[PDB]
Homo-oligomer: A and B are copies of this chain.
Amino acid sequence: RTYLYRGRILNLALEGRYEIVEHKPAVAVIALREGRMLFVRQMRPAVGLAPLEIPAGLIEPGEDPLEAARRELAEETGLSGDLTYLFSYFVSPGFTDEKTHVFLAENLKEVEADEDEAIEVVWMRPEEALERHQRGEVEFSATGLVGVLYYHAFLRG
């Protein structure tokens, strides 16, 4: 593996014929409350739009997935809760090693009453999010879709 670029959140490498993008692991948090799922939106320069995502972030040096999940939920929404590890997935194993760990957040509590408004909190019924996407009103990130699908599969009971 030869390196063409070493950066902030990623490294571009070449492994023979394969173009590989090394990337820090990430976490995502699925939170449901009274029928509404906690979605978030922020302008994403990579796509030039703000897709419907769920609280997510990169794992910091020294912390594990669980700790990153707790911190992410807190920084984005000022909330904490009972977190349970659900599953993990490689975002696109064909070119990047980015791995995402997904957690479920229950019994949410306020720990902080973001002042910069960098992240838009969008509480919405998953059925409504799916409906809007099917209509072409909003785009989904992998985490947003996973949250929607996970809800319909196991959280209606």
Contacts and interface: CB of A to CB of B under 8 A. Distances in A.
A9 B95 contact: yes
Contact of A19 (B9, B89, B133, B145): B9
A139 interface: yes
Interface string A32-75: 00000000000011110001010000000000000000000000
Interface in A112-157: 130, 133-134, 139-142, 144-146, 149-150, 152-154
A51 B141 contact: no
DSSP class of A's interface residues: helix, strand, loop or mixed? Answer: mixed
Interface residues of A, number: 51
Contacts of A97: 46-47
A15 B46 CA distance: 9
Given A10-B19, A140-B87, A93 B46 contact: yes
A76 interface: no
Nearest to A144: B89
Contact of A150 (B10, B96, B149): B149
Closest 3 pairs (CB-CB, A-B): A149-B149, A152-B153, A153-B153
